């Protein structure tokens, strides 16, 4: 299932800056065509300088 808007997740996508780190869920998309529906926000910015990213359900531990 999706995480609740406002819940905390752990990223498990290895190529991500935030791997093994915790973020807040801001939005989940409900369409099945979308490939990365969950929007997560983090406290620590990455090298690009952004703090948010879309993820799939199989890349989060909630």
């Amino acid at each position: 299932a999706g995480p609740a808007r406002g819940s905390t997740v752990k990223v498990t996508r290895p190529e991500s800056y935030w791997y093994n780190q915790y973020g807040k869920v801001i939005s989940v998309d409900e369409s099945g065509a979308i490939r990365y529906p969950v929007v997560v926000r983090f406290e620590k910015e990455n090298y690009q300088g952004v703090t948010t990213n879309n993820f799939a359900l199989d890349e989060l531990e909630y």
Binding site: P14, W18, Y19, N20, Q21
Partner: protein, 166 residues
């Protein structure tokens, strides 16, 4: 006691040679000035200090080489068996106490501000009361160290530590 082929500085002729060489230089400089003048007094203070310093090294069981300069012993066994522990071994304990203190104070302040609203503002503007409190409460830092170690609160678990594609 002469070990490792070294002579004690108290009974070394080269040691005296060095002291002579420094004092003679100071005498040469004094020749230019008048026996009552203030430069003269400065050079006398310098010479006094110098002779005092060599005397101190002589009654400290320091060990001189062929150059006539004191040499330090750093194996702890040799140091303790022949009374040279004040050269490296005591300073070790002294450095490791003060370095553990500084670390503990720094880690403590960082773990304290990490729970604030904007924790990064408290890194460029120091919370000075908080920092002084931490600095003075951290004199018994092995308490916190051995507690953290034995309990398990010292290390973050590997699952929570960011890491690359390996």
């Amino acid at each position: 006691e002469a070990i490792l082929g070294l002579t004690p500085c108290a009974e070394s002729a080269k040691f005296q040679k060095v002291l002579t060489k420094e004092v003679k230089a100071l005498e040469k400089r004094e020749k230019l000035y008048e026996p009552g003048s203030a430069p003269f007094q400065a050079l006398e203070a310098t010479k006094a200090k110098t002779q005092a310093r060599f005397a101190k090294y002589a009654e400290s069981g320091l060990l001189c080489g062929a150059d006539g300069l004191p040499h330090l012993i750093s194996d702890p066994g040799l140091a303790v068996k022949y009374g040279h522990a004040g050269e490296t071994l005591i300073p070790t304990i002294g450095f490791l106490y003060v370095a553990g203190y500084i670390g503990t104070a720094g880690r403590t302040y960082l773990q304290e501000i990490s729970t604030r609203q904007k924790p990064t503002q408290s890194e460029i503007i120091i919370d000075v009361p908080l920092a002084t409190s931490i600095a003075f409460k951290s004199w018994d830092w092995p308490n916190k160290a051995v507690k953290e170690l034995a309990s398990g609160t010292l290390l973050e678990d590997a699952k929570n530590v960011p890491v690359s594609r390996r």
